[PDB]
A paper describes a structure:
This movement disrupts several hydrogen bonds between the binding loop and protein core, indicating that a significant conformational change of the binding loop occurs upon binding to trypsin. When rBTI binds to trypsin, its P1 residue fits into trypsin's binding pocket and forms hydrogen bonds with trypsin residues. To counteract with this situation, rBTI employs a local conformational change mechanism: the Trp53 at the P8′ position undergoes a rotameric switch, with its indole ring flipping upwards and occupying the original position of the water molecule.
Here, we report the crystal structure of rBTI at 1.84 Å resolution and the structure of rBTI-trypsin complex at 2.26 Å resolution. Within the loop, the P1 residue, Arg45, is an ideal substrate of trypsin, which ensures the inhibitor's tight binding to trypsin.
Author numbering:
A (entry chain A): 19 to 114, 118 to 241
B (entry chain C): 3 to 69
The structure:
């Protein structure tokens, strides 16, 4: 997260860290046994870390649980990142750290949201934080979004952030939450650089997938 | 903390395809991915990936790093 602020411990209880030896992506806990992340975060042998604040210091709220399976969306396109959504089942249920509710309707442009993660904090150069970082940012008009990334935005994506640059998600934030008024509306997905002018963040549109999520959980 | 060589300042100004080979030789745990400068990219964090951004002449435009 660049241009953000220190969330503070347990202020984002649904935030998850995906760890394969190192933190590589984020995720959102949607119930005691299931995490929502990005399809491009898929790998085998994911360990899910809940209740994290400082990912480099055990502080007391951590629950590290193996992923028993990771279901990538059937129509995920690894090249264009369309349908960039993945479900991870925990090997054992987490102790409820709390889940975030799914959306019942899509949010509109201009809506203020909370984006968070342990991603790089620099637009230029590199700095990876120990503690969880947060950013408040508005959803942008589908018009702005498409103009920023011509030929690349699908109906399953939205832009959020600041066209003037300086505040954005970044490498290490993928899979993580975009929450707007208590609902998970987005998944950190892609962008050109981080916090560059006219290059806002692009996010998976979670409201398009509520049905797939339910059905997938029920059959797995 | 990733493993092996992490950054290639010497490769700025070099041909992309040539830099990619050098990178992969000097750190056997990464794959080099040549992309046009300004290409959008996923926002995951990896210890096995090195983007190599090139201008329209295929010249390395910034320091490749593991990320
Ligand atoms: Ca910790």
């Amino acid at each position: 997260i660049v241009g953000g602020y220190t969330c503070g411990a347990n202020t984002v209880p649904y935030q998850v860290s995906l760890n394969s030896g190192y933190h590589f992506c984020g995720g959102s806990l949607i119930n005691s046994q299931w995490v929502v992340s990005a399809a491009h975060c898929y790998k085998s042998g994911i360990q899910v870390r809940l209740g994290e604040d400082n990912i480099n210091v055990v502080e007391g709220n951590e629950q590290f649980i193996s992923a028993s399976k990771s279901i990538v969306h059937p129509s995920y396109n690894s090249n264009t990142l369309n349908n960039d959504i993945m479900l991870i089942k925990l090997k054992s249920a987490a102790s409820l750290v709390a889940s975030i509710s799914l959306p019942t309707s899509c949010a509109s442009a201009g809506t203020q949201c909370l984006i968070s993660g342990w991603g790089n904090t620099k637009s230029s150069g590199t700095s990876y934080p120990d503690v969880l970082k947060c950013l408040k940012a508005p959803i942008l008009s589908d018009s702005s979004c498409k103009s920023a990334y011509p030929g690349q935005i699908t109906s399953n994506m939205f832009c959020a952030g600041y066209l003037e640059g300086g505040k954005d998600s970044c490498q290490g934030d993928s899979g993580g939450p975009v929450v707007c008024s208590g609902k998970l509306q987005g998944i950190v997905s892609w962008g050109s650089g981080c916090a560059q002018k006219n290059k806002p963040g692009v996010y998976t549109k979670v409201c398009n997938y509520v049905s797939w999520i339910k059905q997938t959980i029920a059959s797995n | 903390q990733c493993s092996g060589k992490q950054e290639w300042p010497e490769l700025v100004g070099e041909r992309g395809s040539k830099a990619a080979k050098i990178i992969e030789n000097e750190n056997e745990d990464v794959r080099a991915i040549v992309l046009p400068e300004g290409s959008a990219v996923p926002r995951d964090l990896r210890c096995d990936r090195v983007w190599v951004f090139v201008d329209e002449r295929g010249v390395v435009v910034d320091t490749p790093v593991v990320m």
